[PDB]
């Protein structure tokens, strides 16, 4: 049993065809994102041309960050932050949107900052602070080999397939999210833009629905 040339070469061949499949999929996903956003813009202009108004859809997904530390947290907020896997200051998680989830976030309003993110900051997160739950261990993603070894069940083969399912929330969002370890973010490099956090974002503070400036906040925090 030499096991030097044939086996290594066949692994490289299998690798190559997997690279090609990943590449065509990423092409499809780029087409999907660009197509979708440009159709949204175009339909907005169409309704504005007609005189009508284009009610855009809401966002199926949010990103939540725990702001408040661990001390002096009543039992319902504490249990809810534990359910959303927010056990430290400056920690973030994706969340699907529902009646239930949104009421849950209204419970934990004084402790978190949540908002509607974009593909850019999702990609930045999953490339720089992105980990995986392999046998209850936090492992770096770092390879689509790892990712498909854990998520070949669910139609996933790559980090970009994962991000794709995330932002276009799928029938595997649950498994993808429970695979993604919560994000362990640093403090915002640009500061928080305010002198006093603990007031709702409206009133000159930080917490609550920072519905689209969450991208700025996350990038400064990463």
């Amino acid at each position: 049993a030499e096991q030097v040339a044939a086996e290594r070469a066949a692994r490289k061949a299998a690798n190559k065809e997997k690279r090609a499949i990943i590449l065509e999929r990423n092409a499809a996903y780029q087409k999907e994102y660009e197509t979708a956003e440009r159709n949204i813009i175009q339909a907005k202009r169409d309704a504005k041309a007609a005189g009508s108004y284009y009610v855009e859809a809401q966002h199926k997904l949010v990103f939540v960050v725990r702001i408040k530390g661990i001390n002096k947290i009543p039992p319902k907020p504490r249990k809810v932050l534990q359910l959303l896997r927010l056990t430290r200051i400056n920690s973030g998680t994706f969340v699907k949107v529902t009646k239930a989830t949104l009421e849950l976030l209204k419970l934990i309003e004084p402790y978190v900052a949540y908002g509607y993110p974009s593909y850019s900051t999702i990609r930045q997160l999953v490339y720089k602070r992105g980990f995986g739950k392999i046998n209850k261990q936090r492992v770096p993603l770092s390879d689509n080999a790892i990712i498909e070894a854990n998520l070949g069940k669910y139609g996933i083969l790559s980090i970009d397939d994962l991000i794709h399912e995330i932002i276009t929330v799928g029938p595997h969002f649950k498994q993808a999210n429970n695979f993604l370890w919560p994000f362990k973010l640093s403090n915002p490099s640009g500061g928080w833009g305010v002198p006093r956090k603990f007031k709702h974002f409206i009133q000159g503070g930080s917490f609550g629905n920072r519905e689209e400036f969450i991208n700025k906040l996350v990038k400064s925090m990463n």
């Binding site: 530390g69 661990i70 001390n71 947290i73 534990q82 056990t87 430290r88 200051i89």
Partner: peptide, 8 residues
């Protein structure tokens, strides 16, 4: 500080 759910 970590908010532990289980015991350490």
């Amino acid at each position: 500080g970590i908010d532990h759910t289980s015991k350490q």
